[PDB]
Amino acid sequence: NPEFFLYDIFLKFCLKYIDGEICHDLFLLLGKYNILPYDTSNDSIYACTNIKHLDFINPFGVAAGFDKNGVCIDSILKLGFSFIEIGTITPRGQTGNAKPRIFRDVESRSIINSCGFNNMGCDKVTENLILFRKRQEEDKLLSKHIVGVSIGKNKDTVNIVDDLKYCINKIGRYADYIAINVSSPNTPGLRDNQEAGKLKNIILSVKEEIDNLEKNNIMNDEFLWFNTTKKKPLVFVKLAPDLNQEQKKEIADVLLETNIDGMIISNTTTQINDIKSFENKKGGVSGAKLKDISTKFICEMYNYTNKQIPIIASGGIFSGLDALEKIEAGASVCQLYSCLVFNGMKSAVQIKRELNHLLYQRGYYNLKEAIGRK
Ligand SMILES: Cc1cc2nc3c(=O)[nH]c(=O)nc-3n(C[C@H](O)[C@H](O)[C@H](O)COP(=O)(O)O)c2cc1C
Ligand SMILES: Cc1cc([C@@H](C)NC(=O)c2[nH]cc(Cc3ccc(C(F)(F)F)cc3)c2C)no1
Ligand SMILES: O=C(O)c1cc(=O)[nH]c(=O)[nH]1
Numbered sequence: 001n002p003e004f005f006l007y008d009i010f011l012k013f014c015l016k017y018i019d020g021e022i023c024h025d026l027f028l029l030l031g032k033y034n035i036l037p038y039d040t041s042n043d044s045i046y047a048c049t050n051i052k053h054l055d056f057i058n059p060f061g062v063a064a065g066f067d068k069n070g071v072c073i074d075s076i077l078k079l080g081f082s083f084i085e086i087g088t089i090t091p092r093g094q095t096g097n098a099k100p101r102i103f104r105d106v107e108s109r110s111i112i113n114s115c116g117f118n119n120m121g122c123d124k125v126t127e128n129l130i131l132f133r134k135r136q137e138e139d140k141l142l143s144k145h146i147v148g149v150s151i152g153k154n155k156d157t158v159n160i161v162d163d164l165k166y167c168i169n170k171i172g173r174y175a176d177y178i179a180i181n182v183s184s185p186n187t188p189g190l191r192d193n194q195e196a197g198k199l200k201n202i203i204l205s206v207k208e209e210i211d212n213l214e215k216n217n218i219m220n221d222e223f224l225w226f227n228t229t230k231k232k233p234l235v236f237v238k239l240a241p242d243l244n245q246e247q248k249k250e251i252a253d254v255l256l257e258t259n260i261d262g263m264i265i266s267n268t269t270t271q272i273n274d275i276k277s278f279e280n281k282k283g284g285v286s287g288a289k290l291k292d293i294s295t296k297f298i299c300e301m302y303n304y305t306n307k308q309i310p311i312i313a314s315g316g317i318f319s320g321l322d323a324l325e326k327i328e329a330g331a332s333v334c335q336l337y338s339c340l341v342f343n344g345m346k347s348a349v350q351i352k353r354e355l356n357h358l359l360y361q362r363g364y365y366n367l368k369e370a371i372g373r374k
Contacts, residue, residue: 003037004346011344020102020111020341028067031075038141039080039349044356046366049332051262051310054177054234056333057144058082059323059355059367060348063314063335064150064179064238068119070128074135077145080348085335086125087150088181091166093121094154097186105277109318109342110290112275113268114186114283117152126171133174133226146228149175150238152184160193161205168209174226175233180206183240183267185284191240196250199237203258207235236312238264241290241297242271248297252304262310264335265301266294269315287338291316295329299374302330307372318343320354324362330372 014023030036043058061083062076070086096118104111136142149171153163182193210232217224225231268284294315313331317323318339326334340347364370
């Protein structure tokens with residue numbers, strides 16, 4: 001804990017004096033050289049959870065966009081997170097929009113971004129994940145930690161599906177699950193793929209390409225799936241909150257039609273117009289202000305899918321209570337982003353015990369029961 005205390009000092013100075021992207025890069029540099037603190041505590045057995053046959057030692061991971069290139073997986077997980085979603089990645093590396101592209105508002109614990117899927121591309125990120133998977137076998141703090149991969153398209157690409165299949169064939173073996181990103185607001189025209197007709201086509205094509213890796217392989221499953229599950233990656237789809245309610249219904253049954261393994265709710269939003277310092281800026285907003293809207297989006301989709309599609313929660317989770325709200329709404333695991341930005345190295349340590357203490361007070365035996373009790 002003395003270690004976490006020092007990094008909070010650096011955090012505060014960063015938020016006030018340094019550009020956000022520069023801080024974010026320092027974060028990842030510290031992680032790349034393994035000088036962040038560790039959370040070596042046994043996670044409460046009553047707080048574990050699962051998405052279908054995917055097991056999470058605890059209900060908290062890091063959302064996509066934090067480690068877009070998988071250069072910092074070890075150290076983020078060792079902060080106390082049960083999993084991480086890297087990406088979103090694209091087939092080829094791209095620069096994204098021009099800096100400064102991210103702006104934070106400490107006062108409201110909110111953020112606005114317009115990066116534009118900047119990443120090194122899938123060939124490079126794949127070799128980064130392979131190395132992690134090698135280290136994972138050597139490190140007892142990394143065993144049973146889940147790594148998912150968010151996948152998208154390039155600014156230039158016309159065929160959304162052409163980009164996804166390439167990513168899968170390249171990096172599918174090493175992923176525990178795949179997250180289809182059709183919810184980013186800062187790449188023009190991507191959300192249009194969320195319309196049921198286009199989406200169903202995308203899911204089915206994704207699910208297909210995963211199986212073809214399994215089908216044609218001379219070696220056993222033990223050597224094909226170089227991941228944590230030793231099984232083929234699940235398939236999740238991350239959705240945006242800026243949809244009218246009828247659009248949500250058409251998506252729901254498509255998920256049911258395709259037997260999607262899970263749904264991530266939600267992505268950043270553009271509906272927010274209250275925050276002063278973002279009035280000048282463009283892009284998708286995340287943080288506290290996104291909390292209430294994310295929670296509702298969960299209960300609706302949980303409704304439209306008749307509770308048959310596992311939910312991953314995202315958007316405005318800072319507290320152990322914020323988490324229980326997302327779980328009660330029907331979510332099984334929670335993803336964090338803004339919290340890490342405003343709370344720092346201690347984010348996972350703190351939110352885990354808060355939820356633990358809260359589950360006991362509310363009289364829940366374990367976390368699984370609290371799911372969807374609203
Ligand atoms: C700077 C930044 C980059 C992001 N990049 C991605 C991304 O590449 N893929 C994705 O699905 N979501 C991305 N997101 C959205 C977050 O992953 C998360 O879904 C959203 O920020 C809500 O979480 P929060 O309220 O805890 O911050 C990004 C968000 C931010 C602020
Ligand atoms: C992409 C993208 C995201 C961003 C913005 C939104 N991220 C951040 O502001 C951010 N991330 C992680 C932290 C915690 C942190 C803690 C300590 C230190 C150190 F090193 F100083 F001790 C640096 C950072 C912050 C403040 N900019 O680009
Ligand atoms: O990479 C990005 O710019 C991005 C993607 C996304 O899904 N959401 C977001 O806010 N930014």
